[PDB]
Design a protein around this nucleic acid. Structure first.
Lengths: 74, 82, 71, 162, 83, 79, 74, 98
RNA sequence: GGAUUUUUGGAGCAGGGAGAUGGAAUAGGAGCUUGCUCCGUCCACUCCACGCAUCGACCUGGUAUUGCAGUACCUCCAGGAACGGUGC
């Protein structure tokens, strides 16, 4: 399709349940609430997943760009 | 707003700095630069599984410092006003 | 303000500890904004290794302290 | 002209040929080696050549001291507390000294880190079986009088006086 | 805009020096090109690493990102480096 | 002289499947079709798949926003 | 500032690059970049067992570039 | 520009910790979780906090030796501390002060 | 002046398996001392898969070079492998 830049893709992904996995192996799944220009993420009602198994719910979770490895919109 | 101006005004105070390698250096903060270059005098450093050593002077970089420890009698409310 | 923290230890023997656990004891002659240390006639201890004039980068520096009087 | 703190603070210190911090204390004629606490163990080698030291003792705790030059002196006795003051002493040059008997080499056996020893130009080296006694008393030394110790010399030192 | 260790590394181009990397690789030889960002390009270089795999190559190029230290001769430590 | 940004733009225009290797991680890599890019080498892969070379498995995720600080090498595959 | 690396003499030459994690590739450079990004056409990567695998035209970033050795006399 | 991005982006999640005086948790790269009230913040995530509680887990690391003994968890408290934004890995805001 | 070469870090963690093998002088719990039994922490040896291959430093024996220079390192053969790091 049309070539989409990652910044409108991150701006349009707010309010949708996504999952951001870090370089340490752990992932946080939740609704994306805030995404700034420095690739920082702030989510609400986040759930932690480690090695394919859920750990627990934390709520509002803030993840920086230096630790987040990838993000997938579910 | 800027934490460097708050860290530079904490001179002549006995604090501690824990690095990323587990080494904790406790001493009196004498010099702080814009790049968080902590120059302390009469410090005591304890590494991971090692004996504490006392030095007359020490210079630790800002990127190598992981955490800091301030005393409870530090006026953080008055020093925050720029 | 004064920025005399690095100028007071000029032309003196200092021992800098690396990130991997090495120690370089040499005469600090000059510096820069990236904390590039130039240690003339420096020794490497961890055993003694004859190095001489070693220009170590500022990214591998952890801590530095005074070793002794200037030669 | 005894060894004091002002003589050690005014003495020249530089890098030697082996890239080690050496202080040149020659030409002082010190009768006794003392007041070495002003260096604060910041020198890797000690150049005390051409002196009048009679006994190699009275030194404080210096972990960085690895080489000691005592050439052209009148050293006739060695202190028994040499291992407690210099645990990392590996080089000992005692050429042209006043050592006459092998019994002065008995406090030298406590230095486990000593590997290079020089006992040339001495009356103790002219005695019978001096090299075998030095190899038997000090097994940690690998080079004695600019000569590598072999297995046959160690076997001859372990055979006699066992 | 140019540092004094950067100027000392640029003035030492053409001498038999060595550069030890963060992984332990020591590229030794004549410093042909030395930029301001510690980019060392050498010709007829030799690789002596902390792994010990000593070899000889025609040309080598080590960047300043993974460069740990640099061993230079003491011919430029007297003048005009005396400040 | 071929620029890497021009090669990335040609790979995004051709919509070919490319595999991206991670930094300091040789066991797991990603594979997908890059749709767009930015100045920070941020890739937007559609129907991406994480391939683990040790376990010989492939896990699909879908739309993935991979940062440029982790991608060390990128090669073009025929699949 | 932002000076490009001196890669004009190594243009169209077969060189071997080393990447982080112990990776080794060999190929001909087809361009330069100020961010130390190198395009290697018809590149061959060395595996763990020792076999060479041809990956074609690849792009290596400057964040993981360790050392590049020119196998041809320039 | 900067104030609107700080009050509307992820940093507002930090700004709700210092305005309403709520307790948040910070998980670092050294496997330590520090729960406390954020008192001062910046653009580089330099968090100066007061009344923090840091919990982690440690191993004996060849303490006694012979092939049967387990690690254990531990915790400690600090009156006032300051941590840089480089070592901060995860920041979680939860209603734990009530 | 937190987005690839320096300062807001890609760092953290663990050392293969087995054997009626051996030890915690003063420091594990339970069967509520001592003796015995069980289980989540090392070192020494043995076996499988001397964990593997690589190069550097190094020790023994034989052997070659007698040469005026400012140095990553310097002859070759064979045995042993105390050390370093690289990839699995």
């Amino acid at each position: 399709s049309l070539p989409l830049n990652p910044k409108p893709f991150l701006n349009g992904l707010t309010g949708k349940p996504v999952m951001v996995k870090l370089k340490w192996g752990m992932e946080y799944k939740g609704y994306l609430v805030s995404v700034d220009g420095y690739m920082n993420m702030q989510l609400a009602n986040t759930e932690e997943y480690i090695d394919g198994a859920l750990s627990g719910h934390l709520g509002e979770v803030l993840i920086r760009c230096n630790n987040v490895l990838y993000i997938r919109g579910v | 707003m800027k934490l460097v101006r708050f860290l530079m005004k904490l001179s002549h105070e006995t604090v501690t700095i824990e690095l990323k390698n587990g080494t904790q250096v406790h001493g009196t903060i004498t010099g702080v630069d814009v790049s968080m270059n902590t120059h302390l005098k009469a410090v005591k450093m304890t590494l991971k599984n090692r004996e504490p050593v006392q030095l007359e002077t020490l210079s630790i970089r800002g990127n190598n410092i992981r955490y800091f420890i301030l005393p409870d009698s530090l006026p953080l409310d008055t020093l925050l006003v720029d | 303000g004064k920025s005399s923290k690095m100028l007071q230890h000029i032309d003196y023997r200092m021992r800098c500890i690396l990130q991997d656990g090495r120690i370089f004891i040499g005469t600090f002659k000059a510096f820069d904004k990236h904390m590039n240390l130039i240690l003339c006639d420096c020794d490497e201890f961890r055993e003694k290794r004859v190095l001489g004039l070693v220009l170590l980068r500022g990214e591998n520096l952890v801590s530095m302290t005074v070793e002794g009087p200037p030669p | 002209v005894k060894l004091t703190a002002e003589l050690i603070e005014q003495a020249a210190q530089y890098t030697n040929a082996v890239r080690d911090r050496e202080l040149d204390l020659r030409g002082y004629k010190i009768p006794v080696i003392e007041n070495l606490g002003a260096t604060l163990d910041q020198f890797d080698a000690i150049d005390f050549s051409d002196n009048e030291i009679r006994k190699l003792d009275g030194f404080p705790l210096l972990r960085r001291l690895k080489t000691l030059l005592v050439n052209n002196n009148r050293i006739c006795r060695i202190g028994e507390g040499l291992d407690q003051a210099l645990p990392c002493l590996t080089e000992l040059i005692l050429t042209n000294n006043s050592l006459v008997e092998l019994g002065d080499l008995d406090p030298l056996a406590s230095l486990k880190s000593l590997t290079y020893l020089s006992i040339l130009r001495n009356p103790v080296t002219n005695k019978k079986h001096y090299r075998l006694y030095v190899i038997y008393k000090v097994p940690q030394v690998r080079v004695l009088d600019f000569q590598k110790v072999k297995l046959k010399e160690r076997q001859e030192a372990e055979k006699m006086f066992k | 805009s140019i540092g004094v260790p950067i100027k000392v590394l640029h003035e030492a181009e053409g001498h038999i020096v060595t550069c030890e990397t963060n992984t332990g690789e020591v590229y030794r030889g004549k410093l042909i090109e030395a930029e301001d960002n510690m980019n060392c390009q050498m010709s007829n270089i030799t690789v002596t690493y902390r792994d010990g795999r000593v070899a000889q190559l025609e040309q080598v190029y080590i960047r300043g990102s993974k460069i740990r230290f640099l061993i230079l001769p003491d011919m430029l430590k007297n003048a005009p480096m005396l400040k | 002289m071929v620029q890497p940004i021009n090669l990335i733009f040609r790979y995004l225009q051709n919509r070919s499947r490319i595999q991206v290797w991670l930094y300091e991680q040789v066991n797991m890599r990603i594979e997908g079709c890059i749709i767009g890019f930015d100045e920070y080498m941020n890739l937007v892969l559609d129907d991406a798949e994480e391939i683990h070379s040790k376990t010989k498995s492939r896990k699909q995720l879908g739309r993935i926003m991979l940062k440029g600080d982790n991608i060390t090498l990128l090669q073009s595959v025929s699949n | 500032k932002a000076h490009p690396p001196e890669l004009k003499k190594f243009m169209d030459k077969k060189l071997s690059l080393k990447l982080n994690g112990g990776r080794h590739v060999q190929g001909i450079l087809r361009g330069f970049d100020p961010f130390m990004n190198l395009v290697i056409d018809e590149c061959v990567e060395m595996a763990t067992s020792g076999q060479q695998n041809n990956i074609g035209m690849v792009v290596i970033r400057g964040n993981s570039i360790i050392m590049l050795e020119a196998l041809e006399r320039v | 520009r900067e104030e609107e991005e700080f009050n509307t982006g992820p940093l507002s999640v930090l700004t709700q910790s210092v305005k309403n005086n709520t307790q948040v948790l910070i998980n670092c790269r050294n496997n330590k979780k520090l729960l406390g009230r954020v008192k001062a913040f910046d653009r580089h995530c330099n968090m100066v906090l007061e009344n923090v509680k840091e919990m982690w887990t440690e191993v004996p690391k060849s303490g006694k030796g012979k092939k049967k003994s387990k690690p254990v968890n531990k915790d400690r408290y600090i009156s006032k501390m300051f941590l840089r934004g480089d070592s901060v890995i995860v920041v979680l805001r939860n209603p734990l002060i009530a």
